[PDB]
Amino acid sequence: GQKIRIRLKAYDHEAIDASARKIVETVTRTGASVVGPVPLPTEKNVYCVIRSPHKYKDSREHFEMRTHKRLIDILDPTPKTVDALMRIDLPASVDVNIQ
């Protein structure tokens, strides 16, 4: 058949799962074939830092910017559904690669 693949990127797991359910819903609204957010890995961009100025290199701290990622493969891309899913609304925290 045919596919259209979405790769969702975020930092909030609650919200990436929220928009996952929302997008799966809006894909289901057309009776169009829907699969689900497969549990695929997440990057972890990590950065160690020192706390204080001018000395005390032994005291440090860590920080960890994760990257929540979800693949959603939509089968049966009826072009009505395609141009509908082109026009979902979301808040700011999530970004999406439509390919």
Partner: protein
């Protein structure tokens, strides 16, 4: 089908335990092809040693993760758990030597200000 798992410090092995002979096959090879380490062989054998059923139950493995000794402990673990699926009645005599537990002892986080896990820099007083 019969399938159980073994994991020791990032050393995973799956197992097929069949009622045949003790034929060992480990990723296109055998226990005498890999593992030139006799203490490791003892580990690998200790469950069948325990039940006195050495050469009563074929085993087929797929090794991945960890190094030889981690893989070894995971192997003997999975073989014993498969023997428990064969029959649990022998289990409370295997806890008598405890050849059944997962090793809850993994490598440690490396800390800051220091050289590794617990080796501190030389507290120099000059």
């Amino acid at each position: 089908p019969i399938q159980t798992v073994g994991r020791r410090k990032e050393a995973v092995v799956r197992v097929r335990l069949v009622p045949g002979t003790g034929q060992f096959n480990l990723d296109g090879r055998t226990l005498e092809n890999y593992f030139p380490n006799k203490v490791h062989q003892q580990l690998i054998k200790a469950p069948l040693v325990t039940v006195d059923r050495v050469d009563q139950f074929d085993i087929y493995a797929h090794l991945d993760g960890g190094g030889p000794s981690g893989q070894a402990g995971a192997l003997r673990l999975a073989i014993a758990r498969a023997l428990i699926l064969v029959q649990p009645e022998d289990r409370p005599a295997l806890k008598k030597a405890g050849f059944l537990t997962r090793d809850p002892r993994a490598i440690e986080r490396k800390k800051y200000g220091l050289k590794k896990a617990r080796k501190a820099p030389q507290y120099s007083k000059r």
